[PDB]
Design a binder for this molecule. Structure first.
Ligand code: FES
Length: 107
Protein backbone atom coordinates (compact mmCIF):
# COMPACT_ATOMS: atom_id res chain seq x y z
CA UNK A 1 0.00 0.00 0.00
CA UNK A 2 1.51 3.27 -1.12
CA UNK A 3 1.49 5.78 1.71
CA UNK A 4 2.97 9.10 0.99
CA UNK A 5 5.85 10.34 3.23
CA UNK A 6 5.43 14.06 2.63
CA UNK A 7 1.84 13.77 3.86
CA UNK A 8 2.06 14.66 7.55
CA UNK A 9 -0.59 14.61 10.23
CA UNK A 10 -1.01 16.22 13.60
CA UNK A 11 -1.39 13.34 16.09
CA UNK A 12 -2.40 14.41 19.56
CA UNK A 13 -1.63 11.81 22.20
CA UNK A 14 -3.78 12.18 25.32
CA UNK A 15 -3.95 10.49 28.68
CA UNK A 16 -6.22 12.08 31.16
CA UNK A 17 -5.08 10.07 34.17
CA UNK A 18 -1.46 10.99 33.57
CA UNK A 19 -1.95 14.53 32.41
CA UNK A 20 -0.54 13.84 28.94
CA UNK A 21 -1.48 16.00 26.00
CA UNK A 22 1.17 16.29 23.30
CA UNK A 23 0.85 16.80 19.54
CA UNK A 24 3.43 15.38 17.19
CA UNK A 25 3.82 15.37 13.43
CA UNK A 26 3.47 11.88 11.92
CA UNK A 27 4.09 10.98 8.34
CA UNK A 28 1.49 8.96 6.47
CA UNK A 29 4.02 6.12 6.04
CA UNK A 30 5.19 6.06 9.64
CA UNK A 31 3.77 4.12 12.58
CA UNK A 32 2.56 6.45 15.36
CA UNK A 33 4.76 4.81 18.05
CA UNK A 34 7.85 5.19 15.87
CA UNK A 35 7.08 8.92 15.36
CA UNK A 36 6.46 9.43 19.12
CA UNK A 37 9.74 7.73 19.83
CA UNK A 38 11.66 9.75 17.27
CA UNK A 39 10.26 12.90 18.83
CA UNK A 40 11.13 11.92 22.35
CA UNK A 41 7.76 10.83 23.80
CA UNK A 42 7.72 7.51 25.60
CA UNK A 43 4.62 5.41 25.07
CA UNK A 44 3.88 1.95 26.41
CA UNK A 45 5.04 -0.95 24.33
CA UNK A 46 6.14 -4.54 24.61
CA UNK A 47 6.47 -6.55 21.38
CA UNK A 48 6.50 -3.59 18.94
CA UNK A 49 5.22 -6.00 16.29
CA UNK A 50 1.45 -5.70 16.37
CA UNK A 51 1.13 -8.94 18.24
CA UNK A 52 0.18 -7.91 21.76
CA UNK A 53 -1.99 -5.19 23.34
CA UNK A 54 0.56 -3.37 25.35
CA UNK A 55 0.74 -0.30 23.15
CA UNK A 56 -3.00 0.02 22.76
CA UNK A 57 -4.57 3.43 22.26
CA UNK A 58 -8.07 4.54 21.43
CA UNK A 59 -9.15 7.04 18.77
CA UNK A 60 -11.03 10.06 20.13
CA UNK A 61 -10.90 12.01 16.80
CA UNK A 62 -9.85 11.11 13.27
CA UNK A 63 -8.74 8.05 11.50
CA UNK A 64 -5.90 5.57 11.39
CA UNK A 65 -4.98 2.55 9.40
CA UNK A 66 -4.11 -0.40 11.46
CA UNK A 67 -1.56 -2.61 9.71
CA UNK A 68 -3.11 -5.81 8.35
CA UNK A 69 -0.81 -8.07 10.41
CA UNK A 70 -1.97 -6.56 13.63
CA UNK A 71 -3.63 -8.85 16.20
CA UNK A 72 -6.76 -6.65 16.73
CA UNK A 73 -10.23 -7.88 15.84
CA UNK A 74 -12.52 -6.03 13.65
CA UNK A 75 -14.81 -5.44 16.61
CA UNK A 76 -11.98 -3.82 18.47
CA UNK A 77 -11.01 -1.69 15.50
CA UNK A 78 -14.63 -0.61 15.13
CA UNK A 79 -14.61 0.40 18.84
CA UNK A 80 -11.71 2.71 18.19
CA UNK A 81 -8.84 0.72 19.55
CA UNK A 82 -5.49 1.06 17.83
CA UNK A 83 -2.08 -0.72 18.37
CA UNK A 84 0.16 2.31 18.02
CA UNK A 85 3.24 0.24 17.18
CA UNK A 86 1.59 -0.82 13.98
CA UNK A 87 -0.82 1.98 13.00
CA UNK A 88 -0.43 4.79 10.50
CA UNK A 89 -2.40 8.08 10.77
CA UNK A 90 -4.77 8.85 8.00
CA UNK A 91 -5.99 12.17 9.35
CA UNK A 92 -5.16 14.69 11.99
CA UNK A 93 -5.91 12.54 15.06
CA UNK A 94 -6.51 12.59 18.77
CA UNK A 95 -5.71 9.27 20.44
CA UNK A 96 -5.87 8.34 24.13
CA UNK A 97 -2.93 6.27 25.28
CA UNK A 98 -2.52 3.51 27.88
CA UNK A 99 -5.71 1.83 26.71
CA UNK A 100 -4.61 -1.80 27.23
CA UNK A 101 -6.93 -2.49 30.14
CA UNK A 102 -9.94 -0.94 28.36
CA UNK A 103 -9.26 -3.08 25.28
CA UNK A 104 -9.02 -6.19 27.45
CA UNK A 105 -12.39 -5.20 29.07
CA UNK A 106 -14.15 -4.75 25.83
CA UNK A 107 -17.02 -7.12 25.71
S1 FES B 1 3.68 -3.27 21.50
FE1 FES B 1 2.74 -5.27 21.07
S2 FES B 1 1.13 -4.73 19.69
FE2 FES B 1 2.18 -2.86 19.95
Amino acid sequence: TKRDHNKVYNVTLVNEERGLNKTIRVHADEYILDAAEAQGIPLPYSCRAGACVNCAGRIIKGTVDQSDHSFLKPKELDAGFVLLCAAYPTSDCVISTHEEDNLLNLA
